[PDB]
Amino acid sequence: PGLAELRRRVQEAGVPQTPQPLTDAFLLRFLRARDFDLDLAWRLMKNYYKWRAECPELSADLRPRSILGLLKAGYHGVLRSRDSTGSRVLIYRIAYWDPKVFTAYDVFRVSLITSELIVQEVETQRNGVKAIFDLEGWQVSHAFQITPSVAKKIAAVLTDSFPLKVRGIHLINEPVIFHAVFSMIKPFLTEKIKDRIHLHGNNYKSSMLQHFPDILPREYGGKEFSMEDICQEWTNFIMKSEDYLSSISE
Template sequence: MADYESLDVHSHLLGPEESWFPGPPPPLYTCTLSPALEAKARDELQEKPEWRLRDVQALRDMILKEQPNLHTRLDDAFLLRFLRARKFDYDRALQLLLKYHGGRRAWPEVFSDLKPSSVKHVLDLGFLTVLPRPDPHGRYILCLRPGRWKPNDYPFVDNVRALYLTLEKLIQPEVVQVNGIVILADYSGVGMSQASNPGPFLAKKVVSILQDGFPIRIKAVNIINEPRIFKGIFAIIKPFLKEKMAERYVLHGSDLRSLHSHVPGSVLPPVYGGTAADLDLSAWAALLLRSEEEFIVEFCQPHPLEGAALPDSLLYDGDGTEEDGFRALRSQLYYCY
């Protein structure tokens, strides 16, 4: 059952406009998880509250010793994201952190000057949003609507920029770090022009960053209203998915009863047969835009890897052709548990 009490623990950190989405832990870290979520983190993520800050310090020491030129955030709340995403395995958490920064260096067209105002056109179009109510497992629902985008509107990479900013905002609250998220992708209106974008090479890069370089748990991907051409779209994505993640893709077609068996109608808007409020594209866009200064500090400064020497295995392959993309590393969309 959902631990809804835990969703209100950040309300004192937020203005009234933002109170529907939990905020990040306070600057001087204090755990904001409810007892039930602490128990869940212990069971699923190997997180022991009595050792939590000791584990953070261990990871911090590893970074300072092994990557002294990595100018990354070292605060407790930030490092906890990576420990939770890798079940408190120090070595794997460090690898994830390096991949996180490596992806940013390898794809400057996504990460340069990355801030909400630079993707306002994507948000206004309604390519993505986050539903205001989590599902019964406490997981927020990221709603993607690729059919809203047309290739003549703007480059596809702008969608990636908006997606990354959304994930960055989503991962701030500890409840999301523990519960993970669910994706709802509505393919209404998707035709050949969208299906030919981004292509296998760009798809590989998006998948690589999300699977190896971002500390979030993607627990399910629900596809609805997929056209016949979706088989071709999924054929581009599937080579990069591990079996465990591929099994979390559920195709519902236009069957809303099937969707409701995975995502309750009580948290869905009427457009998806639900009983929650109408789909509001402005709320999430406004929340991101109010975070402009926060993202300027995070992404519009000298790159954290400047001067850091990393092995090739920790950097993304930025070269190649679309044919190379099909033959390249077959991996999952996100390494989740």
Template sequence: MALQHESIDLGSPPTEPSPSAAHSWFPAPPPPIYTCTLTPELVAKAREELQEKPEWRLRDVQALRDMIIKEQPNLRTRLDDAFLLRFLRARKFDYDRALELLLNYQAGRKAWPEVFHDLKPSTVKHVLDLGFLSVLPNPDPNGRYILCLQPGKWKPNDYPFVDNVRALYLTLEKLIQPEDTQVNGIVILADYTGVGMSQASNPGPFLAKKVVSILQDGFPIRIKAVNIINEPMIFKGIFAIIKPFLKEKMAERYVLHGSDLRSLHRNIPPSVLPQQYGGIAAHLDMAAWSRVLLDCEEEFIVEFCQPDPLEGVVLPDDAFLDGDSAGGQDEDTFRALRSQLYYCY
């Protein structure tokens, strides 16, 4: 029943980006062994805004890892450096709050199986083809990618609303991979053109609360602004459903522009906006983000569509020992080994 530990390939990454993904306009997935990719400017920004000290970064990751192993021994989660850094950065290197966020992240995956079961891009291709969401190819001057939502394109008779949530979650998972995003955060642009009573009455308060809980309490991403444009009169009713679940800080980041593009441009410059929003960038290509996600199908299968990665696997007894006990290997080399093992945890 038990497998030999040699079956774990420690010399190769858990996933390999497809050739098409490697040539995408969006950054490729990070390697399994953490290497900082932040520019000196972003290192300084992370230090100032997130209390991230480069010289203590991996020490802080190890401290969070130790907390998880000690306080949550039954939690099945990745423990590699790059993954845990997302949660530390999202909570400004507060260990307790980072652990709470991680627990919420994992609890959400278990509590909402209709969202997370068999979660991969091909299962939401109809959402992507419809244009319900996309990501603009150029970040804003603050380095933040812009997630563009067009809820008016969805009709309740097309497919269940939960499919939109699935596509949104996959998008967030992809957006949070680059370290730039972990430091800079993202901006949401929601165009409510075409939204009527049928969309407003669906999903309802219960589903709305679950979506909001993912965005502000259950996912390691910093949402810096939510720009609403072309909102109909009925949007007041929609926002009345959402607002009770928003924290004050998040509610203050909602900006309603109506049809005033000049107001929008004060928040998102025309240089990165497509033509339909008064910008000078190319017309919004709804298929571009779809290609990014679909090119990463195998990556998401590994992340969301596999059984427990350690089921039946016996790891070597010394796999998680300190570098001094690792048969003479130097600390950096052993950290690389542990990072790959923790990825499989």
């Protein structure tokens, strides 16, 4: 169908054949991220490659060892269950990011690594992801790291530049500023990615439980497992996938 077109276009523009094999599976990432709308999936593919060549410091190296320290510290875990809509749910925790040891680029890379791992799941291509950022422990040094360059790339990676549907961004324990940072974007923003950005603040337990019943760690309201558990499980996973993360590295 539109897969027949996509491949042809890919040949024509001389889309880099490496490191990712241009398989049918890989092309359906783009098709699925755009509900099989050919123009749109192709525009995304182009933006994907465009973003990678602009950012070799981020895109070229997906090998996890360089950031093993950050995984071990407890920055990042992925829930064992999908949410009610088939989304994968990812958790990032600022407290467990030493801004002295890891730069914003190192932290970004974590997400890139996780994204590349979860994009292979057909269910995840279909139902996208939801990212939770627990901002407790937010410092001034974290902010320092978030430059215009970095802000811009955070945007693109959710602005038609990576084959994943962002179904929701949840922030908990954000400092007051984030709301100012955000009151000045709410009405500036589209209607689309505005029903998907949730600032829960300090009093987050109840609203978090409404979006993600029966599947959250004890820290955020659940009762089956802890953040430390899912951090280790996702880290074990990421390491069990280091050969694959090399195969798709420059």
